[PDB]
C-alpha cells in the first residue's frame, strides 16, 4: 500500500539523484533495493517507477493508461515538434501522421529501403576491410555513422557521408548537441544562458537543412524510395489530409533523433555480447556464412538470419537502448490492487528492470543467452518491451531490426572479431544507452562484396 | 544428387521394412548404412528420412517447410481430431487453440500446476516406500501411472487413481488400444481379417469421447473453477479471432494431452532412470544435487528449477532416446535441400530424431556415452542439433510441463531411494507411437526420509 521512495535532498526531494552521468543505471540500483515500484519526486513533479511485469502489464492496458511525455520528451519536443514520438495521442497530428506513415514502416516496406541500407552497410564493411594491421575499430562511433547515414538516405535521400569525415556533418553536430542540452536540462539559471543560445542555434541548423531539402524536393518533383516521398504524396484516410511541410520536417528530424542512437546502441551492445560469449559468436557467424551466400545480401536472406535476430533480441533484453517510457492514468484506477492512482497520475516503465524480472525470465537474468528467444511463443505478454507499448509503440521497429540484422550479419560474414583490450563494459547515457569506449580488432575473412 | 534407398519388395516398395516390432530402430540401422538421407517408398507414398544436423537445420526453416501429418498422425487424428498435435497449421482451430493454450503451458503456468504434480509424485514415492523387502519396481509401468494421473489432474481435475489399480481406468485401456490400432494400421492392406479391429476402434473412440464430453458438461453445469487446463479453455478467448474453443475441440485437446503427453514423458523418466543406474557416477552426482536442493519434505516450484544437473540428465536421456522419435514436414515451395537434393512443392520429409542426436560431427566420437555434462551450456550446441520437442511454432506445447514433471519426480526419486539394477537389465526398447525401455525393473532401498 505505502510506496517506497529513495533518499531525499530537502527541498529538492529526489531530483539530485538524477544529477549523475548514469541516471538509468542509478534508477536500476534503486529498483533493486526498493522493488517493483517506487515514488520519485522533484520540485513540481511526481512519478512512479515500475520494474515488474506484474505492474507493467497493467500500465500497458491502453484502456486505462495513455502515453505521457516525460520531461526528456518534453524538452526533445522543442526540436522534434509534433512529430510522432513527441506528440500527445489526442493531438490531431499524431493520428494523422501515424495513419500516413504506418504502411511505409511495415515489414513489406522494408523491401524498398533494403538497397539503401545495403549502400551504407557496404561502406562500413569496406572501412573495416581497409584498416591496417593492429588498427582497431571504435564500435559505437562507427555504428552511429552507419545508422545516421542509413536514416538520412532512407528518410530523405540525403547523404551525410559520415564515413568520409572525422567531424560529422553540421546537422549531426547540432543534433547531438541539441539532444545533450535537453538531457542536461533535466539534472539542473544565469550561467545556462550560453547553453540556451547554442540550443536555438542548433535548432535553426536542423530546421534549415530539413526545410531546404523538402523545398528542393517539391521544386524538382523527383520521386525516390524514401520516407520524404511517401509523406509528400500520402493522405490520411481519416481526415483526408496530407502532412504539411512543417510536420514533415518534424517527422524527418524525429526519425533521425529517435532512430539513430537506439539502433547504433543495439548493434554495439550486440557485438559486445558476441565477443564476450564466443560460443554465441560462433553460432551466429555460422548462420551468416550459410545464409549470406551472395556478395550483396538480399531482403529475403536477412529474414533467414534467425539466430542473428535472437542475438539482437537478447541484447535488447539486457540493455534496451531506449530505457524507459512514460504513461498517465486516463481516470482514477488502482494499480496491482494496492496502489490507488488518480486521473493524470504519471508512471515510468523502467525497461531494463522489467527485462530482469526473475518471476518471468528465471534466475539467470544477467546471462546473455540468445536461446531464450529461440521460440518466440515462450515470451509472456508485456515481459519484453524494448519498443514500447500499443499504438504508441515504436513505428520504426521493423526498420531497426532489418537494419541491425543486415549489418550484424554482414559483419559476422566478413570478419573475425577480437576483444583485444578485454573491454570492461561502461554504459554511456544520453537520451539512450550505449557501451562507451568499446573497441575491437577485426581480421578480414577476405570474402569479396 | 542421387538419393539412396533401402531394399525393395516389388510392388510393395519399402513397406515390408516397417513390418517389424521395432520400426524406428530398423530405420536407424538403415540410416547407419545409407547415411544422412534416404528415400522411403510405399504404395501411394514417398518420403525422405533425414538424419544429419546439416540437412535437418534446413528442414527446420519454417519459411521453407511446414508440419506434415505423418501416416501415424493421420490415424491418430481419428480420435485426437483437430487437437493441436493432429491439426494442420492452416486449420482455423490450430492457431486458435495455440494462441489460447500457450499461456497455460508457460513456465509461469507451471507454478500453478506444481501442487497437483506433487500430489501424484508423492503417491509414487509412498508406493515405493511401502514395498516389502526384495520386491521390485516395474519402472515404465509406474512412470505411466504417474504421468497419466498427473495429466488427468492438471488437464481436467480428474483422478484416474492408477496407483489404486491393476487394471487401468477404462479410458486409459481404450486410449492404449486406440493408439495400438492406429500404429498397427501402418504396417498393413485393410482386408476382412482387420474388420474386428475396426469395430473395437470405434468402441474405444466412444469411450474416450463419452468420458471427456461428460466431464466438460459437468464442469459447465457446476461453474466451479479449478487450476486445470479445462477451466482455462472454458474461459479463454483467442486474441486474434476473439473466439473461444468450442466444446468439441476442447474434448480433442484433452484427449490430445493424454495421448500425446503421457507416454513420451513416462518413457523419458524410464530412460533417465535406466541411464542413471547404468552410470553410477552420474547417478551419484544427480543424487547429491537432489539431497542438497530438496531440503523440505515437499519440493517447491523454485526448488525444481534449482535441479540443474537433473535437467541435464533428462536432456541427455532425450538425446539418446527421444521418446517421440520423429516428425514430418512438407516443402512449402520448390526448394533445394543441402545444395544437392531438389524438392518439389509438397514433397515430404521425416526427421529421424534418434539419428540426428547421434551425429558425430555435432557430439563427437563418444555419441553413445551418457554424459549429461554435454548440456551445461545451450549456446555451445549448434542450431537444430537437439530436437526432442520438434521445431518452431509446431514444437511441443507441453515441453515445460513435461520437463517440470520429470525434474520434480526424478529429483524426489533420487532424494528418497538408492537404486539397484538387480537383474543387470538388458535394454529392450518397445515401440508404440513412442519409445520406452520394456521390462526395465529395479530395486529401491529407502533412505527413510519422511515426506
Ligand atoms: C533498436 C532500435 C529502437 C528502439 C529500441 C526503439 C525504441 C522505441 C520506444 C521504446 C518507443 C516508445 C517511446 C515512448 O513510448 O515514449 C519508440 C517510439 C518511436 N520510435 Fe523507436 N526505437 C528504435 C528504432 C527506431 C527507428 C530506426 C526509428 C525511425 C526510423 C524509430 C522511430 C520511432 C518513432 C517515430 C516513435 C514514436 C511512435 C509513435 O509514438 O507514434 N525508432 N521507439
Ligand atoms: C518428454 C516429453 C515429451 C516429448 C519428447 C514430446 C514431443 C513432442 C514432439 C516431437 C512434438 C512435435 C510433433 C510433430 O511435429 O509432429 C510434440 C508436439 C506436441 N506435444 Fe509433446 N512431448 C512431450 C510431452 C508433452 C506433454 C506433457 C504434453 C501435454 C500435456 C504434450 C503435448 C503436445 C502437443 C499438444 C503437441 C502439438 C503442438 C502443436 O503442434 O501445436 N507433449 N511433442
CA A221 to CA A240: how far, in whole Å? 22
CB atoms within 10 A of CB B232: 20
Nearest to B379 among A280, A378, A380 (CB): A280
- Cβ–Cβ under 8 Å, residues A323 and A351: yes
Residue A405 Cβ < 6 Å to ligand 1: no
Pick from A86, A79, A6, A90: which is nearest to A41 by CA? A6
CA B166 to CA B169: how far, in whole Å? 9
Chain A residues within 8 A of B61 when measuring between CB atoms: 304
CA A13 to CA A17: how far, in whole Å? 9
- Domain ranges, ordered by start, for chain B: 10-446
Helix (H) or strand (E) holding B162: none
Q: Which are the contacts of A222, defined by CB distance < 8 A and separation ≥ 6? A: none
CA B262 to CA B272: how far, in whole Å? 15
Residue A319 Cβ < 6 Å to ligand 1: no
CA distances from B282 to A150, B273, B293, B371 (A): 54, 11, 17, 8
Ligand nearest to the CA of B95: 2
Pick from A379, A414, A192, A167: which is nearest to A289 by CA? A414
CA B137 to CA B122: how far, in whole Å? 16
Q: Rounded to the nearest 5 degrees, what angle is found at the Cα of B74, between the Cα atoms of B70 and B76? A: 115
CA A217 to CA A220: how far, in whole Å? 5
CA A109 to CA A305: how far, in whole Å? 18
Residue A39 dihedral angles phi and psi, to the nearest 5°: -80, 145
What's the sign of the alpha-carbon dihedral A242, A247, A251, A256?
positive
Q: Which are the contacts of B342, defined by CB distance < 8 A and separation ≥ 6? A: B334, B335, B336
CA distances from B354 to A187, A324, B22, B30, B52 (A): 61, 47, 13, 12, 10
- Can you tell me whether residue B71 is helix, strand or coil? helix
- Cβ–Cβ under 8 Å, residues B217 and B250: no
- Cβ–Cβ under 8 Å, residues A344 and A363: no
Strand residues in A345-407 grouped as ranges (E) = 346-350
Share of chain A residues as helix, strand and coil, in percent rounded to the nearest 5: 55, 10, 35
Place of cell 479445462: B230
- Bridge partners of B437? B429
Q: Which are the contacts of B21, defined by CB distance < 8 A and separation ≥ 6? A: B431
CA distances from A437 to A91, A425, A426, A432 (A): 41, 9, 7, 15
Residue B402 Cβ < 6 Å to ligand 2: yes
Task: Kindly tell me the burial class for residue A446, based on how many C-beta atoms sit within 10 Å of its own C-beta (0-12, 13-18, 19 or more).
Answer: exposed
- Which grid cell is B208? 474416450
DSSP secondary structure string for all residues of B410-425: HHHHHHHEEEE-TT-P
- Cβ–Cβ under 8 Å, residues B299 and B111: no
CB atoms within 10 A of CB A367: 14
Residue of A nearest to B57 (CA): A287
Fold designation for A10-444: Cytochrome p450 (1.10.630)
- Bridge partners of B419? B444
Pick from B99, B101, B62: which is nearest to B391 by CA? B62
CA A344 to CA A46: how far, in whole Å? 11
Q: Rounded to the nearest 5 degrees, what angle is found at the Cα of B48, between the Cα atoms of B47 and B50? A: 145
Task: Kindly tell me the burial class for residue A44, based on how many C-beta atoms sit within 10 Å of its own C-beta (0-12, 13-18, 19 or more).
Answer: exposed
- Which grid cell is B284? 551419484
Classify domain B10-446 by CATH architecture: Orthogonal Bundle (1.10)
Method: X-ray
Q: Which are the contacts of A421, defined by CB distance < 8 A and separation ≥ 6? A: A439
The resolution in angstroms reads: 1.8
- Can you tell me whether residue B343 is helix, strand or coil? strand
CB contact A309 to B (< 8 Å): no
CA A403 to CA A146: how far, in whole Å? 10
- Cβ–Cβ under 8 Å, residues A69 and A88: yes
DSSP secondary structure string for all residues of A95-137: HHHHHHHGGGGSTTTHHHHHHHHHHHHHHHHHHHHTPPTT--E
C-alpha gyration radius of chain B:
22
- Which grid cell is A8? 531525499
- Which grid cell is A155? 528518410
Cross-chain Cβ contact B392/A375 below 8 Å? yes
- Can you tell me whether residue A325 is helix, strand or coil? strand
Nearest to A283 among B98, B383, B392 (CB): B383
CB contact B392 to A (< 8 Å): yes
Pick from B68, B59, B69, B89: which is nearest to B384 by CA? B59
Helix (H) or strand (E) holding B24: helix B23-34
Amino acid at each position: 500500500k505505502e510506496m517506497p521512495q529513495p533518499k531525499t535532498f530537502g527541498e529538492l526531494k529526489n531530483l539530485p539523484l538524477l544529477n549523475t552521468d548514469k541516471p538509468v543505471q542509478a534508477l536500476m540500483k534503486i529498483a533493486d533495493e526498493l522493488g517493483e515500484i517506487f515514488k520519485f519526486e522533484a520540485p513540481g513533479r511526481v512519478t512512479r517507477y515500475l520494474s515488474s511485469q506484474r505492474l507493467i502489464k497493467e500500465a500497458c492496458d491502453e484502456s486505462r493508461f495513455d502515453k505521457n511525455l516525460s520531461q526528456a520528451l518534453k524538452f526533445v519536443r522543442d526540436f522534434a515538434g509534433d512529430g510522432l514520438a513527441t506528440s500527445w495521442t489526442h493531438e490531431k497530428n499524431w493520428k494523422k501522421a501515424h495513419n500516413i506513415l504506418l504502411p511505409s514502416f511495415s515489414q513489406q516496406a522494408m523491401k524498398g529501403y533494403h538497397a539503401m541500407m545495403v549502400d551504407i552497410a557496404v561502406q562500413l564493411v569496406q572501412k573495416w576491410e581497409r584498416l591496417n594491421a593492429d588498427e582497431h575499430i571504435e564500435v559505437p562511433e562507427d555504428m552511429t555513422r552507419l545508422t545516421l547515414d542509413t536514416i538520412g538516405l532512407c528518410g530523405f535521400n540525403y547523404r551525410f557521408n559520415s564515413f568520409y569525415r572525422d567531424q560529422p556533418h553540421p546537422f549531426i553536430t547540432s543534433m547531438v548537441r541539441a539532444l545533450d542540452e535537453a538531457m542536461n536540462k533535466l539534472q539542473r539559471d544565469p550561467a545556462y544562458d550560453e547553453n540556451k543560445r547554442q540550443f536555438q542555434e542548433d535548432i535553426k541548423v536542423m530546421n534549415d537543412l530539413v526545410d531546404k531539402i523538402i523545398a528542393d524536393r517539391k521544386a524538382s518533383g523527383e520521386q525516390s524510395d524514401d520516407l520524404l516521398t511517401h509523406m509528400l504524396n500520402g493522405k490520411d484516410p481519416e481526415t483526408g489530409e496530407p502532412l504539411d511541410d512543417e510536420n514533415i520536417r518534424y517527422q524527418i528530424i524525429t526519425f533521425l533523433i529517435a532512430g539513430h542512437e537506439v539502433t547504433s546502441g543495439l548493434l554495439s551492445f550486440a557485438l559486445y555480447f558476441l565477443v564476450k560469449n564466443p560460443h554465441v559468436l560462433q553460432k551466429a557467424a555460422e548462420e551468416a556464412a550459410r545464409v549470406l551466400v551472395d556478395p550483396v545480401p538480399s531482403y529475403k536472406q536477412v529474414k533467414q538470419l534467425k539466430y542473428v535476430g535472437m542475438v539482437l533480441n537478447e541484447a535488447l533484453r539486457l540493455w534496451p537502448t531506449a530505457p524507459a517510457f512514460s504513461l498517465y492514468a486516463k481516470e482514477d484506477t488502482v494499480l496491482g490492487g494496492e496502489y490507488p492512482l488518480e486521473k493524470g497520475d504519471e508512471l515510468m516503465v523502467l525497461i531494463p528492470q522489467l527485462h530482469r524480472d526473475k518471476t518471468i525470465w528465471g534466475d539467470d537474468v544477467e546471462e546473455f543467452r540468445p536461446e531464450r528467444f529461440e521460440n518466440p511463443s515462450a515470451i509472456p505478454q508485456h515481459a519484453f518491451k524494448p519498443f514500447g507499448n500499443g499504438q504508441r509503440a515504436c513505428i520504426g521497429q521493423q526498420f531497426a531490426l532489418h537494419e541491425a540484422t543486415l549489418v550484424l550479419g554482414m559483419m559476422l560474414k566478413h570478419f573475425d572479431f577480437e576483444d583485444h583490450t578485454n573491454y570492461e563494459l561502461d554504459i554511456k547515457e544520453t537520451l539512450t544507452l550505449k557501451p562507451e569506449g568499446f573497441v575491437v580488432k577485426a581480421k578480414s575473412k577476405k570474402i569479396p562484396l
